From a paper:
Protein splicing is catalyzed by intervening protein sequences termed inteins. As the first step toward understanding the spread and evolution of inteins and cross-talks within the “inteinome”, we determined the crystal structures of mini-inteins inserted at the same insertion site within the putative cell division control protein 21 (Cdc21) from the hyperthermophilic archaea, Pyrococcus abyssi and Pyrococcus horikoshii OT3. The cell division control protein 21 (Cdc21), belonging to the MCM (mini-chromosome maintenance) protein family, is one of the proteins invaded by several inteins. The structure of the PabCDC21-1 intein revealed the HINT fold characteristic for inteins from thermophilic organisms.
Author numbering: 31 to 279
Write the structure that this text describes.
């Protein structure tokens, strides 16, 4: 047998193509893209781990049949609350760990088991992580638990925010923070923040610590290159301490 039929899937959408092993896959993915209603480079085609490039064939990537090419949507419109891989999450035991390591670990543990979740723009995985977060009614630092780890495609632009105190985080343009208007603590999306506006941080990264309202001094829009962004979902309080800042889900 020479010709090979792969299943191309965005998690939801699955289309079966059969092509011969010498064919470049340029038009397989161009066809799938048009079937999805978008042009080819708003999508990401992945075999096992590494991302394909258009001018490759089945044999040079060691293909089999019923093999799958997973596609991930490039976010147009931001809309995907998440943060940079290196964002240091503050664990419930006091230590700090980059959220990307946390999420990738959770993802391969979910994959070795049978509960890795897939969405068109990435993956999620069950987790049970004790974090430090802001108590939305006590307004002091508390312990919480995250149940879902999230790994999504990088948006077309991201925002790096740095505060007068010297805290700095790289987040998607929609990622919300805590603000204070008239005595209201509200949440504001990142792109809504203005230079000089104060966002909530922990005064110390210790339990029962109160809020330090930190003046935002730098807001930088930039084209990223990191390929994946990450987040943690924490029920009830919907936030956690990352890079010394209260980041809201």
């Amino acid at each position: 047998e020479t010709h090979i039929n792969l299943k191309v899937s965005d998690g939801s959408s699955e289309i079966f193509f059969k092509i011969k092993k010498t064919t470049p896959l340029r038009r397989l993915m161009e066809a799938f893209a048009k079937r999805q209603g978008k042009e080819m480079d708003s999508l990401r085609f992945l075999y096992d781990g590494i991302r394909i490039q258009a001018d490759q064939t089945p044999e040079d990537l060691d293909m089999e049949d019923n093999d799958i090419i997973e596609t991930h949507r490039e976010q147009i419109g931001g809309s995907g609350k998440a943060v940079d891989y290196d964002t240091e999450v503050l664990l419930g035991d006091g230590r700090k760990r980059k959220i990307g390591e946390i999420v990738e670990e959770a993802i391969k543990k979910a994959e070795k088991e049978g509960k890795l979740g897939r969405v068109d723009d990435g993956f999620y995985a069950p987790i049970n992580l004790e974090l430090y977060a802001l108590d939305v009614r006590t307004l002091k630092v508390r312990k919480v638990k995250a149940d879902i780890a999230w790994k999504r495609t990088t948006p077309e632009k991201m925002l790096r925010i740095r505060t007068k105190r010297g805290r700095e985080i790289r987040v998607t343009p929609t990622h919300p923070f805590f603000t204070l208007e008239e005595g209201r603590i509200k949440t504001k999306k990142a792109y809504e923040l203005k230079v000089g506006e104060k966002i909530a941080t922990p005064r110390e990264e210790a339990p029962e610590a109160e809020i330090f309202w930190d003046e935002v001094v730098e807001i930088e829009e930039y084209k990223p290159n990191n390929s994946w962004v990450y987040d943690l979902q924490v029920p009830e309080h919907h936030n956690f301490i990352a890079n010394g800042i209260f980041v809201h889900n």
